[PDB]
Amino acid sequence: EPFFVKFLKSSDNSKCFFKALESIKEFQSEEYLQIITEEEALKIKENDRSLYICDPFSGVVFDHLKKLGCRIVGPQVVIFCMHHQRCVPRAEHPVYNMVMSDVTISCTSLEKEKREEVHKYVQMMGGRVYRDLNVSVTHLIAGEVGSKKYLVAANLKKPILLPSWIKTLWEKSQEKKITRYTDINMEDFKCPIFLGCIICVTGLCGLDRKEVQQLTVKHGGQYMGQLKMNECTHLIVQEPKGQKYECAKRWNVHCVTTQWFFDSIEKGFCQDESIYKTEP
């Protein structure tokens, strides 16, 4: 099923561009096809709903068409769509490739800037972003453990990955080494069980203490030998007693039992503290 498309031609044009140009010539009549210059591209004043192919996604031409609201994609989306015999994306925002097509991302515990950056990569790669969780969300991107969104996602067993997964999909796909998101190993970017947690303990024997410390670092958290202000996030403590316990209560640090920590390691995700409060 054919579509109108304008290839934007600059002096320096990528191999990928010319390959898309040829497959398009082959795929449909040259009626739906137009090749334009940087020169004329600039005189376009309205969005005519046709598809534009630009490479790279920068320069003054790109900025112009983008500002007009044009539907722009990189040669790669066209190549991929003709190979899998699917339709070109709507491209409300520019789409550079289809590496993440059919991925639907939600985010939690990221800095604002970092969330924005992640949204943009996913969109550039033809994925969709869904903030709130439901059955349509395929992957949660988490920068740390413990938010309610993280909890809901872990109980459904959705994958919970780090932003580096996204950034790795991007870089590898820039250097043409990858074509789908399945091409790399998800398990390498799993969010660590204790990422973001800073753990202190009290009332344990030296042996139990050493183990918790080992197992904390192993699972991405930090271990502190003493309770300090605005450092420690969790105090492992069995009984609501004693000066150290009492000071963490004042500071509103989570006081949780030993079982919080071991159920976390065993179930594969940071457990909800309120199930495990030292003082129920």
Side-chain angles (χ1 to χ4, degrees):
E1 256 226 43
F3 50 92
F4 294 98
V5 63
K6 289 175 218 185
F7 276 76
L8 171 271
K9 179 136 170 57
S10 59
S11 34
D12 43 305
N13 255 137
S14 106
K15 314 84 257 299
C16 198
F17 183 98
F18 290 110
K19 184 190 169 206
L21 198 32
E22 287 313 304
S23 308
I24 275 282
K25 286 174 170 177
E26 163 165 347
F27 160 87
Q28 70 189 9
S29 151
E30 291 201 34
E31 286 307 307
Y32 310 88
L33 175 58
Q34 189 149 320
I35 295 172
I36 76 162
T37 340
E38 176 160 2
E39 213 247 291
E40 345 135 340
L42 291 145
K43 302 187 217 304
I44 297 161
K45 261 67 200 188
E46 347 76 56
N47 172 24
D48 72 354
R49 331 266 261 240
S50 64
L51 223 221
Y52 294 76
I53 313 296
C54 314
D55 198 16
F57 272 21
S58 67
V60 278
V61 179
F62 175 87
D63 293 319
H64 182 56
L65 298 165
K66 184 173 178 161
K67 159 195 72 96
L68 277 175
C70 291
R71 307 168 46 239
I72 310 141
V73 303
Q76 172 55 30
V77 4
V78 143
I79 284 148
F80 167 104
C81 284
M82 282 173 315
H83 288 189
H84 309 259
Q85 304 185 312
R86 62 159 283 174
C87 68
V88 179
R90 301 170 284 103
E92 303 191 57
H93 42 63
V95 10
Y96 192 84
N97 63 52
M98 293 294 283
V99 176
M100 294 188 74
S101 66
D102 305 326
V103 176
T104 301
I105 282 292
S106 174
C107 292
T108 194
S109 307
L110 307 164
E111 275 158 24
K112 192 178 165 179
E113 285 283 346
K114 175 59 70 187
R115 221 172 62 226
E116 298 192 313
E117 168 186 23
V118 164
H119 286 354
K120 190 176 191 201
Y121 291 136
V122 175
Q123 298 173 324
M124 284 190 311
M125 284 192 271
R128 46 208 306 255
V129 163
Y130 272 28
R131 182 190 50 213
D132 308 336
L133 284 187
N134 84 338
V135 291
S136 297
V137 167
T138 62
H139 315 253
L140 180 67
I141 307 304
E144 309 177 357
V145 111
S147 74
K148 307 280 160 201
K149 202 180 298 171
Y150 172 100
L151 290 167
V152 166
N155 287 279
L156 302 166
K157 306 242 280 91
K158 287 180 195 309
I160 311 195
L161 315 169
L162 296 172
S164 64
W165 181 61
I166 295 299
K167 170 62 109 152
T168 301
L169 301 168
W170 183 244
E171 292 309 320
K172 255 53 189 308
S173 83
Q174 229 58 61
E175 59 174 44
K176 308 298 187 182
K177 155 67 166 43
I178 230 94
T179 60
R180 220 58 177 86
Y181 73 97
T182 50
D183 295 357
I184 227 307
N185 188 26
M186 222 176 268
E187 308 297 307
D188 285 3
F189 303 85
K190 275 197 34 135
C191 179
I193 292 166
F194 298 125
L195 219 202
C197 305
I198 294 180
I199 307 177
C200 285
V201 316
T202 195
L204 298 188
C205 59
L207 255 15
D208 283 348
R209 203 175 340 95
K210 176 54 170 163
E211 171 166 57
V212 158
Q213 194 231 102
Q214 271 158 356
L215 292 178
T216 292
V217 164
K218 177 192 177 203
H219 286 298
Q222 268 160 228
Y223 181 87
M224 305 280 265
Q226 173 69 109
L227 215 211
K228 301 163 163 201
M229 260 271 71
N230 314 305
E231 294 209 41
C232 181
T233 61
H234 300 71
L235 176 61
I236 295 160
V237 54
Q238 262 337 271
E239 317 259 65
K241 292 170 182 139
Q243 190 176 3
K244 185 176 272 197
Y245 164 84
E246 284 294 337
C247 169
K249 207 208 175 140
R250 285 198 305 287
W251 289 5
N252 314 121
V253 163
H254 282 123
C255 296
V256 290
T257 62
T258 253
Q259 277 90 176
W260 168 82
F261 178 89
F262 295 96
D263 292 3
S264 291
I265 287 163
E266 192 200 300
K267 295 173 85 203
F269 68 93
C270 174
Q271 296 309 293
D272 172 8
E273 294 80 4
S274 49
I275 292 172
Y276 294 93
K277 268 151 79 58
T278 303
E279 184 62 279

